[PDB]
Amino acid sequence: GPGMQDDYALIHKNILHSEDLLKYILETSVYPREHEQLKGLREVTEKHEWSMALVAADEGLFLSMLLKLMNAKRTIEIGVYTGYSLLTTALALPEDGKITAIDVNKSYFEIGLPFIQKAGVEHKINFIESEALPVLDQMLQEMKEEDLYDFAFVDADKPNYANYHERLVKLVRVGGAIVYDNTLWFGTVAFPEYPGLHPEEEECRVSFRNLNKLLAADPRVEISQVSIGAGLTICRRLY
Amino acid sequence: SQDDYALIHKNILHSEDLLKYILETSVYPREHEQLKGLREVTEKHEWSMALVAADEGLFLSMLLKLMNAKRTIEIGVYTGYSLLTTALALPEDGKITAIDVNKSYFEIGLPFIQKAGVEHKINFIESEALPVLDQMLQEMKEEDLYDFAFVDADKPNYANYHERLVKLVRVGGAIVYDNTLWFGTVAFPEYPGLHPEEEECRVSFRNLNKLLAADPRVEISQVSIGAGLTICRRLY
Ligand SMILES: Nc1ncnc2c1ncn2[C@@H]1O[C@H](CSCC[C@H](N)C(=O)O)[C@@H](O)[C@H]1O
Ligand SMILES: Nc1ncnc2c1ncn2[C@@H]1O[C@H](CSCC[C@H](N)C(=O)O)[C@@H](O)[C@H]1O
Ligand SMILES: O=Cc1ccc(O)c(O)c1
Ligand SMILES: [Mg+2]
Ligand SMILES: [Mg+2]
């Protein structure tokens, strides 16, 4: 989508039955706890032409909760867009935390950069403007035990999730977390066939159905599929 | 009894097919065998609704491992699915303080927990948790604080359990409250057609959700998994 919208047939990625329950969750437990600059970044992004790709706000507060409970301090993110999940991660890490951000389109990143600077956490971010898989392939060859990541957030092009997985279970430390966004894909994953989809909407649906089967059978990780936001899967490296 | 209630089987996801997809694809292949046996015996029990969701169970296990929890406390054991999930996730030297008013529910799943080989990690306490939490407030040194707390007992007492647990859990420790979305009924000021006790839990959770969101002693994150849960993290 972004990097390669109204052509989509699916509109609401949140998988809940009630829009009133979703609004309740956001106004009761998210917006009161949402950073001032995360709010400004969100409102601007909701007016962008690819606003559907914006990470869910309740999904953002959850990622921040995981980063602190696991005391993550060196993370990597694949797929930044305007940087809501990047700013969420930067606010969650300690003062000397470091993030390796990767996106093919920096013009999306510069939409949220003013909010990242005014939040005072831009110093933690190393933005790489490139396709992620070439960067991950170099990282694995030059990999030292010292330079392992604690946490990986995958939110870029959807068909490449399985390929990203093979690199990230070597680039993330044992006991580290790998979180994949959109693993429930508008609920269309629960059906072998889903008519009425754009060709790449259907390609992402098939790729997630295959990815969810692969992750559930991968002994290198423990998995946990969480029905929050667009749906996400948490993988924890065992070896 | 169980069929007097109206909210036993109301989903929060938009499809029963989507939930069944999650369980069959990502939960049952990763479910311990003793957790399967405990789950299938409990679904036949008179109070099968109180059993924690299986996708929720894997999620609690993931939290305990990522935060490297070692000493936890559970309030509301029932047959022990969340207890066996916790005891399976902690290191072999991990300890759990399990509290429930009903020892008879616990011994239903005790054979599965003994066959799983994790009974040595659990210290069950047959009592109301609120008198137990108060005695620990006077008896606990700073280095005995818990890393994790799972609240899943009588719902109108969550806010009272919270005041005790924000001082019994370590700084940076986690407190998880189950059913904080109460079958989706918390989204409305009024909700007709509910059992009186169901309506009482619904207004208690609407109060608790606003309480936890304004509690500066913790950071929160409400997660719409299973029946809905809220993760709190102690700040001071
Ligand atoms: N091949 C690729 N490699 C790396 N990033 C890619 C990519 N293809 C697309 N992307 C990027 O992935 C992003 C997906 S939108 C991601 C939203 C963001 N995670 C948030 O929190 O809101 C887009 O910005 C797009 O530029
Ligand atoms: N005041 C109290 N103190 C401690 N436990 C209580 C309590 N009141 C009720 N309970 C117990 O809390 C349990 C709630 S059902 C909890 C289910 C369990 N968490 C699971 O994984 O399935 C019941 O078994 C009930 O006996
Ligand atoms: O590409 C479309 C898209 C749609 C929703 C998302 O959450 C996302 O990351 C991308
Ligand atoms: Mg996404
Ligand atoms: Mg429960």
Q: Judge whether A96 and A120 are in contact, CB under 8 Å.
A: no
Rounded to whole angstroms, the Cα distance separating A215 from A221 reads 8
Contact: A30, B222; criterion CB under 8 Å: yes
Q: Judge whether B87 and B112 are in contact, CB under 8 Å.
A: no
Which chain A residues contact residue B174 at CB under 8 A?
69
Which chain B residues contact residue A234 at CB under 8 A?
59, 62, 66
Q: Is A103 in the pocket of ligand 3 (CB under 6 A)?
A: no
At residue A149, φ and ψ (nearest 5 deg) are -85, 150
Q: Is B191 in the pocket of ligand 2 (CB under 6 A)?
A: no
Rounded to whole angstroms, the Cα distance separating A84 from A109 reads 10
How far off is chain B from A180, nearest CA to CA, in Å? 14
Nearest CA in chain B to A151: B66
The set of residues, in sequence order, having a beta carbon less than 8 Å from that of B153 and lying 6+ positions away, is B75, B76, B99, B100, B101, B129, B161
Contact: A28, B222; criterion CB under 8 Å: yes
A160: its two tokens:
């490449």
Residue whose CA lies nearest to ligand 3 atom number 5: A53
Q: Judge whether B223 and A228 are in contact, CB under 8 Å.
A: yes
> How would you list the strands of the sheet with A149-154, edge to edge?
A125-129, A98-103, A74-78, A149-154, A172-181, A232-237, A221-226
Rounded to whole angstroms, the Cα distance separating A217 from B87 reads 23
Cα A212 to ligand 4 centre (Å): 16
Angle CA B201–B152–B183, to nearest 5: 45
Distance (Å) of CA B155 to CA B152, B201, B229: 7, 6, 12
Q: Judge whether A194 and A238 are in contact, CB under 8 Å.
A: no
Contact: A17, B26; criterion CB under 8 Å: no
Rounded to whole angstroms, the Cα distance separating A192 from A203 reads 12
Considering every ligand atom shown, identify the ligand nearest to the alpha carbon of residue A203 and give its number: 3
Contact: A216, B29; criterion CB under 8 Å: yes
Angle CA B182–B7–B205, to nearest 5: 20
A119: its two tokens:
């939040």
**Structural element, H or E, at residue A113:** helix A106-118
Q: Is A113 in the pocket of ligand 3 (CB under 6 A)?
A: no
Sketch out chain A's domains with CATH numbers: 19-237 (3.40.50.150)
Distance (Å) of CA B146 to CA B46, B118, B167, B215: 32, 19, 10, 20
Which pairing describes strands A172-181 and A232-237: parallel, antiparallel, or unpaired? Answer: antiparallel
Q: Judge whether A115 and A191 are in contact, CB under 8 Å.
A: no
At residue A109, φ and ψ (nearest 5 deg) are -65, -35
Q: Judge whether A88 and A65 are in contact, CB under 8 Å.
A: no
The set of residues, in sequence order, having a beta carbon less than 8 Å from that of A177 and lying 6+ positions away, is A66, A70, A72, A150, A151, A152, A234, A235, A236, B66
Which pairing describes strands B229-234 and B169-178: parallel, antiparallel, or unpaired? Answer: antiparallel
Q: Is A103 in the pocket of ligand 1 (CB under 6 A)?
A: yes
Q: Is A175 exposed, middle or buried (0-12, 13-18, 19+ CB in 10 A)?
A: middle
CB atoms inside a 10 Å sphere around CB A169: 19
- Experimentally, how was this structure solved? X-ray
The set of residues, in sequence order, having a beta carbon less than 8 Å from that of B8 and lying 6+ positions away, is B2, B49
Q: What is the DSSP string of chain B?
A: -GGG-S-TT--SBS-HHHHHHHHHHHTGGGS-HHHHHHHHHHTTSTTGGGSPPHHHHHHHHHHHHHTT--EEEEE--TT-HHHHHHHHHS-TT-EEEEEES-HHHHHHHHHHHHHTT-GGGEEEEES-HHHHHHHHHHH--GGG-EEEEEE-S-GGGHHHHHHHHHHHEEEEEEEEEETTTGGGGGGSS--TT--HHHHHHHHHHHHHHHHHHT-TTEEEEEE-STT-EEEEEE--
HEC states along A18-81?
CHHHHHHHHHHHHHHHCCHHHHHHHHHHCCCCCHHHCCCHHHHHHHHHHHHHCCCCEEEEECCC
Report the sign of the C-alpha dihedral through residues B186, B56, B24, A179, in that order. Answer: positive
Residue bearing tokens 């169901």: B198
Rounded to whole angstroms, the Cα distance separating B182 from B160 reads 18
Considering only CB atoms, A212 lies closest to which of B25, B58, B213, namely B25
A35: its two tokens:
């950073």
Q: Judge whether B82 and B58 are in contact, CB under 8 Å.
A: no
Helix (H, G, I), strand (E, B) or coil at A154: strand
Which pairing describes strands A232-237 and A221-226: parallel, antiparallel, or unpaired? Answer: antiparallel
DSSP state for residue A163 in the 8-state scheme = H
- Residues with Cβ within 5 Å of ion ligand 4? A 155, 181-182
